[PDB]
Ligand binder design. Structure first.
Ligand SMILES: Nc1ncnc2c1ncn2[C@@H]1O[C@H](COP(=O)(O)OP(=O)(O)NP(=O)(O)O)[C@@H](O)[C@H]1O
Ligand SMILES: [Zn+2]
Lengths: 121, 261, 576
C-alpha cells in the first residue's frame, strides 16, 4: 500500500454518512497559487456556475471581488448543495462526475458541522 | 495498388466485392464477437437512444467497456484486476447498468448467447441479420461478450466469416474467400458450403481458393494452377468442371478428385 | 398589442396610391379574393407592404420558388426592421422518399439530410405564430404539408415560477419529453445542460437568450436570463414558459392509443390479405409493423414514424392534416405571389404523393392508413382561405374567376415604357439586327435543332454566343452577358427565374407561329416583359401566322405601351 477512488467508491463513502447531514460538493480549480485570477473567474461565470468559495468564504461570482496577487488563494467552485437521504444516488453520482471532470480528478466534500474530507482518483 | 497485369475485362458485370483474406486474427481483451461483427455499435446506439439515457445525458460511447466514459475505473474496464468487487467485474459502473432496453441492461445483453439474441433482437433488422449469420456459421452456443483471447481458432475464423458474409448483397456482388476452412470440422464445412451455395443461387458469384476436397467437389468451375510451387509453378494445368479436371492425368487435384467423385 | 411600423424613403408614385386605396377598401368591405395586375418593375413589393401595414393583420406570402421567397423575405425585413418577419421553406438538402416498383421488384430506402439554419427559421416562425399577432411569414408551398397539432403544441408548454416545489429530475424528464437534447459540449439552439444545482435551457426559438434556474433543496429560487455570448446576467423574470423543440410533440397516452390502433389495423389488414392471397406482402407488412411498434414501445420515436400520423393524432380517416395555415389565426390574410405558377404547384402535391404511395400500400409495405399522411388538396386549401390576394403579372382563369375585384398597377415609378412590337416575315435580318444592336452597345437575345443551328452560325460568323443547355450556370451566364463577354444568348426555355438582364434591348421570337406551351399567351407576355428593362428596348417577332393568343398578347402590349406613353407625356416625366 503506497487514496485512489472511483466514482462508485466515492458515492458509497459519502453514503456512509448519517441521514440528514448537509454536504456541499466542491471542485477546487486552484490549490496553493498566487495570481490576479480574473479571466478564470470570468470563464467560470460564463460556464454557468454561480457559487464560488474563496479563502473559505462563499461569494457570488456575479458580484465583483478583490484578491491580492501576492497572496495565495484557494478558489473552489460550488457545484451542488445536496442532502443525505436514500434515493439520491443518481443526482449524487452526476454531481461527483461533473466535479471530477471540472477539477481533473479531485473532489472535496464539505461536511457542514463536521471534518472536511478529500477524495481523489 | 493492384499487382502486375495488363488489364482485366468484365468488371462492368459486377457491383460490389467482398473479400476474406488469409491473414491472422488479432486477439485482444478489448475484442469480442459483438465488437468484431459490428453489431455492438448498433446495440450501443439503441441503448443510447432510450429515454433514460437521454435524461442522464449518455451517448453511445458511454456503454462501451473500452471507453473511459462509463466504464469502471477500479477494473480499468477489464473486469479483472482477481475479479473486481466495486463493479463486480461487469466493467460498467452502477449508473451505466441502469438503462434497460426491454428490461435488460448492457451486461446481460453481452451475456446472451447467439440463439438468445436471435429471439431478443428479432425485431431490429440490422442486428437480426448479423445474429442470424452468426447462428448460420454454427456459433449459436457462443456468448456475445466472450473475450476474443478465449476464442478457439475455428470459432475466430467463423466469427470473421460471419462478419464478412453478413453484408448487403445486390445480386451482382463478387465473393472472394482465401481458404476459409482453416480450423473447421466437416460439419462446419457443410454449413459453410450450404451458405455459399445459397449465395450463388441468389445470383451472386463466389470464388474460393480451397484445398478441401469436400468443398471442391461441389464447385461448378475449377481453375487448377501449378504444376508445382515457387518458380516451378504459375501456369494453368486444368480448367473446367470437376469431372473434366479429374480426367486430366498430370493434375494433382484431378488425381485426388478421381477417388472422391 | 404591437402594431405595424413601416420605414421607407421611396414614396408611392403613379398608380401606386390608387391601387393601395382600392386594395384597402376592398379588404375592408370583405371581398374574399382580389387580383393585382402589377407589371414587372412597378414595385409590387412596396404595394404589398403598404396594404399589409394599413390592414394590420397577419400575412402569409406564398412563392413558387426559393429564390423569390428569399428575396421577398429580405425585402420585408428591409421595410419592417422593427416588426417580425419569418421564413418557412424546406430544410431537406437531399430527400429520397421510399418507393416500390412492382415492374422491377426493387425497393429504395429513405435517405434525408437536415439543414440547421432552415430548421431554426421554421421553429422561429412557428414560435412567433403563437407569440405575436403582427407576424409576416414568407413560405413556399411547404406551408400546406402536415405539421403538428396546435393544441398539443400549446398544452405541452412548461411553466416555471419561483417558490414552486419540483424535483430537478422531474424537470429534466419533462424537458426530454418535449424533444430537448442534453449536451454539455455542443451547446446550440434546442439543447439544455445541467451543472449541479443549476439547470440551463436554450430555447429553439431564441438564438442569444438562455434561461437559468437554481434549486435550493426541493424548490426553485431564482429564474434569470443570460446572454449566450457574453454569459452575463441580463434580467430576472418571475413567470417563464418553454416551447417544445419539435412541432410533432405527443403525449404518452396518445402514443399508447396509437399503438393499440396500429395493432388493430395491422390485424385487420393481415386478415384481409390472408383472404386475398398475398402471403409475402402480408408477411413483410407484419414484420415492418412489428418492428415499428417495438421501436415505439421501447424508445418512442424513430424513422418511419410519419406514416402513423393519423393514428398518433387520432384524426378521423380522410381528414386533412394540420398545417401552418391552421397555426395562423382565423382572421389572417393570404397573399400568393406569381399565382399562375404557384396554384398548379399547390394542386400537384396531393396527386404526386398519392401516386408515389399507391405502389407502396398496394404491395403490402405500409398500412392503408399511410394515405392520410398527405399534403392538403386544392379544395381543402381553398376552403381554409379566409382572405386572399393574387399578385401576378398575368392572371389565369382561376384567379380572374375567383376574384370579386380587379385592380391594376401599370405605370412604373421610374417612367419606363413597355417595348413596342414589330413583326417580320430571316437569318440575314437577324444578323443585321444583331450587328445594329452591337453598334449601339445593346445585347440581343434569341428565343433545339434551330437553336443549335443559330449558335453554330453565330460562332462561325465571328459572333460571341451564350447558349444555355441549373441556376449555378445560369448566374455565371448572366454575369458573362452583363460583363460583355457574350453579345447574344440563345435558350431552349427562356422562362427561368432571374434570367432577365437590364442591358437587353432586343429579343426575337423564332417559329412563334408553331403551337406549343412556350408559345402561349402568358409565356409570350412573360418573354416580352423581359425587354422592358431597356429604355429603348423593343421586341421583334419572326412568324408568318397569327393566333388568338398572339392577338390578345399584342393588344395587351399595345394598350400598356399607349397608357405608359400617355402617362409619361402628360406628366412630363423623363424616361430614364
Ligand atoms: N480461457 C478460456 N476460458 C474459458 N473457456 C475457454 C477458454 N478458452 C477457450 N474456451 C472455450 O472452450 C471451448 C474449447 O476451446 P478449445 O479447447 O480451444 O477448442 P478446440 O477443440 O481446439 N477447437 P478448434 O481449435 O477450433 O478446433 C470453446 O467453447 C472455447 O470458446
Ligand atoms: Zn471495477
Amino acid at each position: 500500500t503506497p487514496s485512489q477512488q472511483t466514482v462508485d467508491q466515492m458515492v458509497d463513502r459519502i453514503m456512509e454518512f448519517e441521514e440528514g447531514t448537509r454536504i456541499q460538493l466542491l471542485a477546487p480549480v486552484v490549490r496553493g497559487r498566487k495570481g490576479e485570477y480574473h479571466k478564470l473567474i470570468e470563464d467560470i461565470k460564463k460556464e454557468g456556475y454561480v457559487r464560488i468559495r474563496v479563502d473559505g468564504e462563499v461569494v457570488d461570482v456575479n458580484d465583483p471581488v478583490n484578491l491580492d496577487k501576492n497572496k495565495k488563494h484557494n478558489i473552489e467552485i460550488v457545484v451542488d448543495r445536496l442532502i443525505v437521504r436514500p434515493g439520491i444516488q443518481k443526482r449524487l453520482t452526476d454531481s461527483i462526475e461533473t466535479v471530477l471532470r471540472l477539477s481533473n480528478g479531485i473532489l472535496v466534500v464539505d461536511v457542514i458541522g463536521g471534518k472536511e474530507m478529500l477524495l481523489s482518483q | 495498388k493492384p499487382g502486375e497485369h495488363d488489364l482485366i475485362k468484365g468488371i462492368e458485370y459486377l457491383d460490389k466485392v467482398i473479400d476474406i483474406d488469409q491473414s491472422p486474427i488479432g486477439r485482444t481483451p478489448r475484442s469480442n464477437p459483438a465488437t468484431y461483427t459490428g453489431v455492438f455499435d448498433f446495440i450501443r446506439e439503441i441503448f443510447a437512444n432510450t429515454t433514460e439515457a437521454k435524461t442522464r445525458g449518455y451517448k453511445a460511447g458511454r456503454f462501451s467497456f473500452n471507453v473511459k466514459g462509463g466504464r469502471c475505473e477500479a477494473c480499468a474496464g477489464d473486469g479483472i484486476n482477481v475479479p473486481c468487487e466495486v463493479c463486480k467485474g461487469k466493467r460498467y459502473n452502477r449508473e451505466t447498468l441502469e438503462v434497460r432496453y426491454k428490461g435488460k441492461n448492457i451486461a446481460e445483453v453481452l451475456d446472451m448467447t447467439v440463439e438468445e439474441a436471435l429471439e431478443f433482437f428479432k425485431n431490429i433488422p440490422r442486428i437480426h441479420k448479423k445474429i442470424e449469420t452468426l447462428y448460420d456459421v454454427g456459433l449459436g452456443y457462443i456468448k456475445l461478450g466472450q473475450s476474443s483471447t478465449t476464442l478457439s481458432g475455428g470459432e475466430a475464423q467463423r466469427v470473421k466469416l460471419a462478419t464478412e458474409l453478413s453484408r448487403k448483397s445486390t445480386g451482382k456482388t463478387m465473393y472472394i474467400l482465401d481458404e476459409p476452412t482453416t480450423g473447421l470440422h466437416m460439419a462446419d464445412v457443410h454449413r459453410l458450403v450450404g451458405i455459399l451455395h445459397r449465395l450463388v443461387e441468389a445470383g451472386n458469384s463466389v470464388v474460393v481458393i480451397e484445398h478441401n476436397l469436400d468443398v471442391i467437389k461441389t464447385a461448378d468451375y475449377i481453375i487448377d494452377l501449378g504444376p508445382e510451387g515457387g518458380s516451378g509453378g504459375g501456369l494453368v494445368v486444368a480448367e473446367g468442371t470437376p469431372e473434366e479436371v479429374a480426367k486430366v492425368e498430370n493434375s494433382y487435384t484431378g488425381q485426388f478428385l478421381k477417388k472422391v467423385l | 398589442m404591437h402594431k405595424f411600423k413601416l420605414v421607407s424613403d421611396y414614396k408611392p408614385c403613379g398608380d401606386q396610391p390608387e391601387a393601395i386605396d382600392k386594395l384597402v377598401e376592398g379588404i375592408n368591405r370583405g371581398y374574399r379574393g382580389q387580383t393585382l395586375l402589377g407589371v414587372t418593375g412597378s414595385g409590387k413589393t412596396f404595394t404589398m407592404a403598404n396594404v399589409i401595414e394599413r390592414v394590420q393583420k397577419p400575412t402569409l406570402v406564398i412563392a413558387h420558388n426559393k429564390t423569390l421567397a428569399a428575396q421577398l423575405c429580405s425585402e420585408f425585413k428591409e421595410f419592417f426592421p422593427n416588426n417580425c418577419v419569418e421564413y418557412f421553406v424546406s430544410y431537406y438538402d437531399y430527400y429520397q422518399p421510399e418507393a416500390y416498383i412492382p415492374a422491377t421488384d426493387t425497393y429504395i430506402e429513405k435517405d434525408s439530410s437536415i439543414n440547421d439554419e432552415i430548421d431554426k427559421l421554421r421553429h422561429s416562425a412557428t414560435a412567433a405564430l403563437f407569440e405575436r399577432r403582427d407576424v409576416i411569414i414568407v413560405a413556399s408551398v411547404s406551408c400546406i404539408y402536415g405539421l403538428g397539432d396546435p393544441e398539443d403544441y400549446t398544452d405541452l408548454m412548461l411553466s416555471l415560477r419561483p417558490g414552486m416545489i419540483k424535483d430537478r429530475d422531474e424537470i429534466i424528464r419533462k424537458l426530454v419529453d418535449i424533444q430537448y437534447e442534453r449536451n454539455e459540449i455542443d451547446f446550440k439552439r434546442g439543447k439544455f445542460r445541467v451543472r449541479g444545482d443549476i439547470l440551463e435551457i436554450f430555447p429553439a426559438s431564441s438564438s442569444d437568450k438562455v434561461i437559468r434556474v437554481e434549486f435550493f433543496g426541493e424548490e426553485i429560487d431564482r429564474i434569470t436570463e443570460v446572454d449566450s455570448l457574453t454569459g452575463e446576467i441580463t434580467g430576472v423574470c418571475s413567470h417563464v414558459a418553454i416551447f417544445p423543440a419539435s412541432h410533432y410533440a405527443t403525449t404518452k397516452a396518445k402514443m399508447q392509443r396509437a399503438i393499440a390502433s396500429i395493432e388493430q389495423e395491422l390485424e385487420e389488414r393481415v386478415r384481409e390479405l390472408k383472404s386475398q392471397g398475398k402471403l409475402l406482402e402480408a408477411q413483410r407488412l407484419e414484420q415492418r409493423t412489428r418492428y415499428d411498434l417495438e421501436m415505439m414501445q421501447e424508445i418512442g420515436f424513430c424513422q418511419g414514424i410519419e406514416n402513423y400520423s393519423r393514428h398518433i393524432s387520432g384524426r378521423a380517416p380522410g381528414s386533412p392534416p394540420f398545417t401552418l395555415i391552421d397555426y395562423f389565426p382565423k382572421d389572417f390574410l393570404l397573399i400568393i405571389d406569381e399565382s399562375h405558377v404557384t396554384i398548379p404547384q399547390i394542386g400537384a402535391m396531393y396527386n404526386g404523393d398519392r401516386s408515389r404511395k399507391e405502389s407502396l400500400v398496394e404491395y403490402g409495405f405500409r398500412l392503408p392508413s399511410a394515405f392520410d399522411n398527405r399534403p392538403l388538396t386544392f379544395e381543402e386549401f381553398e376552403k381554409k382561405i379566409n382572405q386572399v390576394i393574387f399578385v401576378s403579372a398575368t392572371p389565369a382563369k382561376y384567379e380572374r374567376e375567383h376574384s370579386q375585384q380587379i385592380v391594376e398597377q401599370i405605370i412604373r415609378p421610374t417612367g419606363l415604357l413597355d417595348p413596342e412590337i414589330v413583326v417580320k416575315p430571316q437569318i440575314d435580318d437577324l444578323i443585321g439586327e444583331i450587328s445594329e444592336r452591337v453598334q449601339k452597345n445593346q445585347r440581343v437575345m434569341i428565343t433545339k435543332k434551330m437553336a443549335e443551328d443559330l449558335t453554330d452560325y453565330l460562332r462561325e460568323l465571328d459572333f460571341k454566343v451564350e447558349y444555355l443547355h441549373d441556376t449555378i450556370e445560369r448566374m455565371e451566364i448572366i454575369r458573362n452577358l452583363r460583363l460583355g463577354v457574350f453579345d447574344v444568348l440563345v435558350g431552349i426555355n427562356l422562362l427561368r427565374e432571374g434570367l432577365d438582364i437590364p442591358e437587353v434591348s432586343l429579343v426575337a421570337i423564332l417559329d412563334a407561329d408553331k403551337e406549343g406551351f412556350l408559345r402561349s399567351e402568358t409565356s409570350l407576355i412573360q418573354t416580352i416583359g423581359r425587354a422592358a428593362r431597356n429604355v429603348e428596348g423593343k421586341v421583334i417577332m419572326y412568324a408568318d401566322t397569327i393566333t388568338d393568343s398572339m392577338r390578345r398578347a399584342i393588344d395587351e402590349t399595345n394598350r400598356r405601351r399607349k397608357i405608359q406613353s400617355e402617362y409619361n407625356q402628360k406628366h412630363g416625366i423623363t424616361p430614364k
